Each structure stands twice: as C-alpha cells, then as structure tokens.
Symmetry: C3
Subunit: 358 residues, 3 copies
C-alpha cells in the first residue's frame, strides 16, 4: 500500500509562557519530486537572548545537505532586534560551501513590515484574524571577501550586468534568484517579489578585496504569506528568556521520504482572548508550498497526534475532536483527524483549532 506514517507531539508550558516542545516524525514510501535523488538535509536553528543587549537575539542556523552525492553547507549567525512594531534590524555573518567551493559573507539590514489599510472596524469584530495583506521592505548591505578566482569572476560578471542592464537587471534577477520550482511557488502563495534596486557596488581593499553591495527589494502578500501577516508573532523575543532550538532532518530518494523534527521554542501557544489559549494558528505557506508536492501519489494516513497541556489545564474546544484523553494528555487519530491530515498534506488550509484553558 502507499501509506503515510506519522506521529506528532506537543508538550506545552503554562502560566505566562507560550513555549512548547514539538516533535514530528513521518515516513512515506513515495518518491520525492526533486530531479536529483537521493537528496538528504539537516537544519538546526537556535536563538538565545544576548546578555548585555536588551531585546537583541542571537539567532543561528546551520544547514547541511547532500544532493546527488554533493555536500553543501550554510552557516549563519545573526543578531536581530525590533526597533518598532514595524521595523526590525539585523547584523550577521556566515559561510556556505558546495563540494570543493566555499565563500563567506557578512551583512546588516533593516526590514519594515507595512500592513495595508488596517482598521479598528476589523480588529474589534474578528476574533481570530488570518489573512493580513501587506508589503515588507528589505534594505541590505552585504560584503563578501573576493578571496578566490570564482568570486572575482562572478563579481565582474555582476558588475557588467548591472552597468549594462538598466531596469532589466533587477527585473530578470528574480528567475535567477528563485531557482527551479521556487519561482512558481511565489504566486501560489499570493506572494509578490519586487524588482531589486541596486544602490551601490564597491570593492573595499578587507585581508584582501571585498565586494560590497547596498540593495533593496520588497515582497508582498495577500494574507497567506505568514512572514507578513504574522510579522510580530513570528519573532517572539519577549518570551525568549532562555535558549530555544529546533532541528529537522530528512532523507529522500526515488522510493521514500523520511523526516524528523524536534524543537523547544516560544510561540507554540497563543492567547485566544477570554481567558482561553490556542495552539498557534497553523502557518499557511508551509501547507500551500508543500501542496505543490503532496498530490503526486495516492496514500492512506496512519497518523497520531498527542498534545500534553500544562498541569490542570483542559481542552475547551477541538475540531476535529480528540479521540481520547487522560489527565493532560489528548490524542487524535483516525476519522475526521485523519481526513484533515490528508487534506493539509495535499495543500488544504482548513482550520484545526485547539482551544484550552487554566
């Protein structure tokens, strides 16, 4: 049979905390859609508060992949802080490698989230808003040491293209940037990527010569794009009073996919009003984008979810309904929950709400 086997667990903190431990595991005997297989990847993301800096988070991520035998890596360390509810700043550094090749980088930037035409008439009438339309402006200064011949060559290639290419450069860069199926995924999610505008390009010297570029773009969304709709929520700095982490890994080939995720992080629950809390609303881009790959083989669901509430708390509402309960432990499987799992794995965004209370 083609059967998708999966297991998910959430363990929630109580009191004023929004933290939870999250676990997910899945195995399915279908090919992945990658046109190079096997393809394997591990990612780790960490965040900790910085001791001597009020509201600043040290965020790091490490990616390792193997694609048709070729080993790749990316490492990034970044300090991130809000300036206002709309404006966030970042400064960081990192490196990447592909086979025998590597390069490093450093950057700083500002991102301004701008909702379109928000109103109190909406706010006071919609208890759990989902789609929030907006545009999010990036301003980036980046630096790369030109410390091998390929880097020199690519710098020169870009300088000629920018010099010669007027508006075309920043227009046509989008199908370079969003390689492969990434480009189609933009519109799928009601997202838009603006042209790039290059403000300046300079070689400094570092050490050695460094290619320095100041550039800008914006992206927009009609409300599915969670990076815009949930801009403040997705950076839960006030809850980060200790280190948070998540890691995920998958292995895939032309006969199967297997994946594991483990994390401990703020923002797993959220205040729902009225003395209630919910599991955070499911982000929509993961569902819509995974929907672009989840429809290629028929499958049966073999899936269980366990949610462990904080001590003494109880479920107030869940739909699909839990299958069973004992004290803080609630379990879902089969029936309507299994049809919901099938639905979201194929791209559906139907709501599975879980509300609970002290």
């Amino acid at each position: 049979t083609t059967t998708a086997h999966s297991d998910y667990e959430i363990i929630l903190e109580g009191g004023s905390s929004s933290w939870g431990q999250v676990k997910g595991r899945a195995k399915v005997n279908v090919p992945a859609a990658i046109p190079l297989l096997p393809t394997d990847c591990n990612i780790r993301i960490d965040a900790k508060p910085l001791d001597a800096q009020k509201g600043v988070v040290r965020f790091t991520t490490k990616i390792e992949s193997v694609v048709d035998s070729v080993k790749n890596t990316l490492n990034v360390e970044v300090d991130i802080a809000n300036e206002t509810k709309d404006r966030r700043i970042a400064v960081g550094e990192g490196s990447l490698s592909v086979g025998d090749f590597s390069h490093s980088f450093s950057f700083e930037g500002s991102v301004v989230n701008m909702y379109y035409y928000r109103s109190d008439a909406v706010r006071r009438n919609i208890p759990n808003p989902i789609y929030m339309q907006g545009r999010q402006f990036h301003d980036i200064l980046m630096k790369v040491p030109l410390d091998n011949n390929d880097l020199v060559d690519t710098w020169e290639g870009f300088q000629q293209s920018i010099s010669g290419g007027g508006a075309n450069f920043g227009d046509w860069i989008r199908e370079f940037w969003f390689i492969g199926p990434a480009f189609a995924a933009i519109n799928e999610g009601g997202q838009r990527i603006s042209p790039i505008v290059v403000n300046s390009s300079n070689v400094e010297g570092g050490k050695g010569p460094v290619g320095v570029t100041r550039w800008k773009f914006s992206h927009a969304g009609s409300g599915v794009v969670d990076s815009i709709s949930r801009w403040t929520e997705l950076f839960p700095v006030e809850q980060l009073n200790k280190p948070a982490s998540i890691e995920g890994g998958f292995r895939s080939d032309s006969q199967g996919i297997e994946v594991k995720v483990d994390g401990n992080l703020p923002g797993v629950s959220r205040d729902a009003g009225g003395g209630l809390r919910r599991i955070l609303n499911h982000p929509l881009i993961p569902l819509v984008h995974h929907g672009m790959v989840g429809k290629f083989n028929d499958f049966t669901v073999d899936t269980q979810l366990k949610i462990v509430l904080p001590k003494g708390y109880k479920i107030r509402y869940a739909a699909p309904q839990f299958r069973s309960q004992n004290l803080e432990e609630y379990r879902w499987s089969g029936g309507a929950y299994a049809r919901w799992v099938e639905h979201v794995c194929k791209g559906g965004t139907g709501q599975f709400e879980v509300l609970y209370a002290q």
Copy 2:
C-alpha cells in the same frame, strides 16, 4: 469511506425560451479549506425587467455569512442595461455589515468588453467556440457616506496613500483587493487584473460628508474567463420577460461540507445551430477555481443527474451517455458520468455535451 453524494436536476422550457429550473445538492465528509471554520453562507440573486424602462434589469443580491461566529452581510440593488453589444451600464446601491460594523454605498459605472482580434475565418469554421480572449474595461464612480469614525479614518488613510504613492498605489492595491487565496486564483484562470487608476477623490457635503471616488481598471482573459468570453450570453436580458431567481447555501466545517442550490432563470439552454439546442456550455472559471480546493481528499462519487426536456423533445447526443430515459426524463449516474463528475470536481474542464431537439 470518503464519499461525495450529490444530485442535480434541470427542467427545461421549450419554444423560444432558454429558461430552466436548476437544482443541485451535495454532501461530502471532508474538511473545507477555509482557515476559519465553521463557515456558512447563503446567497440570493434576483433579476426582473423594469416596467417603464426598455432593456433595463433590476438585479439584486443578498449575501449572509457566518465565519468563525462572525455574521456578515452584503445587499446590492442595481439597474443594468446594455448600450451596445460591447458596452453595459449600471447604477446601484447597497450596504455591508461585519459584526457590529456597517457601511452603505452607491455607484454608477460603465463596462466595455473588447475581444481581441476576432475574425469571420474563425466564426464560420468553429461550430461551438469556447476560448475567446479579451479585455474588459471598468469605469466606476462610487460614493460612501463617511458616517462613522472608522469610515473617516479609512478615507484619510487612502487619501494619504494615493497622494504619496504614485504608481505604487494602484499596483500594490491588487494584493489588498484579492485577499487570501483570491490573488493566486487570478493567474490560475488565465486572468489578469490591471493596476487601478484613480481619476479623482472628493468629499461631498450628503446628511453628512460622503467620500466620492472615480476610478478605473481592466481585467483580461485568455479565454477561460467566462465573464469575458461569454459577455453577452451571461446577461440574457432579452429572455427576461418575467422574474428570475437563484439561491444557494452551504455549511462547512472541519468535518464536512453541504450545499444546496435552487434557481429558475434564462440561459440554461442555448441554440446550437442546425435546429438543435444544448445545455449551455459549462462555464470554466467555476471548475478551475473550485479545482484549487477539490484535490485535498480522495473521494468516491455517488451522484445522479436528471434532465427533463420540454414536452416532445428528445436527446440527439450526449457524452457521457445517459444511463436511462423515459419520455422527457433522462438520467445519468455511475460509469463514465461518475468519472466526469470526479474530473470536474477536481478542476477538469472536459466537455459533457447534451444536445436535444424539438
């Protein structure tokens, strides 16, 4: 099992009439894709000829919905008339409500449909044309009393945005306008929405102050967009010699969908040439847009269609073929018809033609 149960019925008028009674009912035990559930909605649309006005139709629609407990309404009454085969005019008024908030509006406008590069070489050779490419130009004057503080606030927000925003305003408005999954659906159907151009914005006074805007946009299609391809057909004013109506309602949540539609209206059949008539060609946007939600759960079809021809008329051709017949009554179920139902519910546009004759 996941089974979709549905039943459809058509009862046709004869002679020179294109009218039919239409009924549809469906129930399916799958979640809807709305990210807020339950979501319920009723719509009623009515059209009647105006006694003292040659070719003018009074068109009304009333929508009531509940989305995550929040009650919404829209009411619109409009007088619509053709000026030429390409140009139609409208004047109307209405109101909307969301929870505790409401506002009213009035408007007038003109819409010009423009096919691209039509030719007699096509006309005389294609017996049943489907894809007709074109662009459809809207010119709108609308008025809203600014009779609560939220309306004042939003007026001021837009005035600043238009003043300050040059071309960006009318560009970026599109992802505000086509909220949520609406934006992606545009391209899915081979449709295009132009930027908005604002011709003027003025507060009048009403009564009290009224926000008045004159603005324009066009939309285009490659031939799937029925609002363009079938522009004259979709407003069957000459057949409307008595009131027409249709109503539909659905209830949905994370475990099921149920829907009912009932109507009596012109345009259910159409002259096919040669002394023949057909059930009107299936519009394609409903199929393509519903295709964006119909692929998220496997289902079995349990579906019957009944078509009742006018007295003495008989089917000349149907594919998929009817299952059974008795006098004017033809029934479809099972076999090829059921595979067609599955197909169109998932987004397929394959032709199911029904031709009949006196």
Copy 3:
C-alpha cells in the same frame, strides 16, 4: 476500475552514438480536460542533415487535428543551424488550415540563449546539473500573403491596434497568444514571456500583397524550462548523420484517452562522465505541464518499461531498480517503478536515473 495502461520501450545505439528508438503507448478510461471533445491529433517531426550545407538541418513538422469535428492542419519546413553555442538561426515556410480556411507563411529568425551568471565553481562541483536559469531572445521576420479577405481584414485590425496601442499592444498580446490554459502554464513552469516589440510592419507588393512584420520577444526560465536549460542538447546536430523522425498520435473524448509515440532520434542517451552514460535526464516541462491535467481522476498503474542496451553494455545504476534482466534487456514494472509512473503522470519531477556502461 480506473486503470492507466501503458508500455514504453527504448532501444539504444552504442559506440559514439546517442541515438535510440523510442516507443510509448497508453490507454486510460478517463475524460480529457479539453472543453471540446472528441479531440484527436497526429504529429510528425523529421530532421535530416542538408548535403550541401555544413551543420544545417532540414526540420519539418506536420500536425493534423480534429476538434469537435473541425479539421486543422499545420505544416512547417525549416532550415536550422547554430552560429555559436548561444546563437541559432532559422529560415522556413509553411501553411495552416482550419476547416475551409487556410493561410501560408514564411519566416527567418535568430534566437540567442543567455544563461544567467554561470560559474566554474558550479560546473566543477555538480556532476549532473538540472536547473539552469536564463533568458532566450527571439528576433523574427515573417511574411504572410494577404491572399484572402480574412487575411486583409486581420492585417488591418493589427495595424490599427499597433498604431493606437503604444505599450499596451505588446503587453496584452500575451493573453491572446497563450490561449486558454496556455497562459497559466507559463508561470507553472517558472517561465516568463516578455512583451512583444514590433520593429516594423509593411505590405510588400509578392503574386499579390504580403504582410511583413519584424518583431521580437524573449522568454525566460528559472531552470525548469528545458528550452533554456538544455538549449544545446535539445538540438543534437552533430549526432544527426542520417534522418531522424518521431510521430505521435492521440484520440480523446469524454470517456477515454489513447496515445501512441514512435521515434528514432539522437539524444536518447548522454555521456554521464567517468566512462558512464545515462538515459537523458527527463525534461521537466512535459511533466509540469501534463501535471496540470493529470490529477483529475484517481487511477491504478499497469505499466511496463523495457530498455535494450547496446550489445555488451550493462546497467550500472537504476533507481527505481529494474524488475528483471536478460542480456541487454532490462524491464521495470510494479512496486517503486509504478509509484514513480503515478508520480510523474501527476506532475512530479522525481529523478529516475538509469546509468549504463560499455
């Protein structure tokens, strides 16, 4: 049951040849998605080297279709040659017919393929690259005798549109050009079509008057578009030391689809490095575009592939693995291969690699 029955065979040439014989057959009892049925079509494509012209290929194609009873044809004969690895030239002529109407044409043009930002850092590290982003510039001079009244009329319609329409003409032409579902398919594949620019329009005289237009456009891809990513590979002129041909035909209606393809052509295998060869990487646009129709009915796979290697060669790697082997003959069916067939018929691009060696 809904069952897709299909059979594929590849017979490879050895030595320095990349040629293979290809056969495919399929039958499936589902409706096609065409909104006019039945629809049938045959295509034949032929290529031969020109005796007195070094590197020039005479390429011909003939299409015959019937769509809702209407017979159509297209015939084109073209001489094609590379000037450089990036620039190709063409000169040709042909005719088309629809029912009682026909017209002829002649043309010449140049096409320049331009990859974006290629690098040796990529080249030396990726053994089998797939996604190659780029833009491909067409420059076309075409001539049509205005030798019937419809041609005169359409010429005049276009002259007025171009004269009057500024940038809109070359913008809005895209939804005329990519009729029906073609328009949506562009973005689906990460493809872009630029506006048209018209350089000139003139009536010559021919004979009689001839409408002559010089015009340009580019298309681009993020790497899925094989016409860009595999620009040199897709025109295997150096291997064409004798005539090549392929033919395909299908019949479809609201109850089934049947198709047959037969060809003998260069480029079926390719050097994989290291003394190895592979079956050419599967082109991605056919899979992505067919994916737009392959998801509308559940189906079971009944499918066999046979690959016959050149004498003495053996498979070095295949995933999904072959089912059985005897001497040069390898067969796939069932199991993982059948899940791969289902996957690619629905739009999946997962890699099925076949490597072999002398």
